[PDB]
Amino acid sequence: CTCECHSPSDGVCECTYDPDGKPPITKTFRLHKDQPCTCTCG
Numbered sequence: 722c723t724c725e726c727h728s729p730s731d732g733v734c735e736c737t738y739d740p741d742g743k744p745p746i747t748k749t750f751r752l753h754k755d756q757p758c759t760c761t762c763g
Contacts, residue, residue: 724760734758 726736735749738760752758 722762724762726758736760
């Protein structure tokens with residue numbers, strides 16, 4: 722299982738987890754002050 726985040730817009734970060742077997746889980750949220758646009762599946 723992996724994941725990849727990106728900055729689709731200012732102060733915005735959309736992550737996408739690709740779990741084995743299950744479909745891709747996309748999680749979009751608002752980036753905080755100097756908040757790193759990353760994720761962690763395991």
